[PDB]
Amino acid sequence: SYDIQAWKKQCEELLNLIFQCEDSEPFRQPVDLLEYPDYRDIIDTPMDFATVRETLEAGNYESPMELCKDVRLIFSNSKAYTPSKRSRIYSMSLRLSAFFEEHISSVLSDYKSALRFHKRN
Ligand SMILES: Cc1nc(CCNC(=O)N2CCN(C(=O)c3cccs3)CC2)sc1C
DSSP states (O other): OOOTTTHHHHHHHHHHHHHHSGGGGGGSSOOOTTTOTTHHHHOSSOOOHHHHHHHHHTTOOSSHHHHHHHHHHHHHHHHHHOSSTTOHHHHHHHHHHHHHHHHHHHHHHHHHHHHHHHTOO
């Protein structure tokens, strides 16, 4: 299964599943800085799933590892901003993280396998 390009469509499809999850609602667009005016005091690098999809479609990811870093930043930003570990929006983050990690594991393994096959000789 040694297609070096296959990760891109696999990531498009997973982003589609994440957009159809009710748990993604708060993470679809960049945070509302009018409702959270202290948000940039806490969070240095905002990230959201629309920004991830646009960066993919622009051809500005070279690997699924770079996409995975930006998705993991959505989740670390939610954990850093939350005033409590039982909060609603943080709770949605944990379920969505578990879903994402379950699905991205094979995408990463197949990509890394394809690159090793390319350099085999
Ligand atoms: C429809 C629409 N949606 C937008 C973005 C909505 N995102 C936020 O407002 N967040 C999500 C990230 N976040 C958190 O993780 C936490 C808050 C509380 C505990 S954690 C802060 C609030 S803008 C727009 C036009």
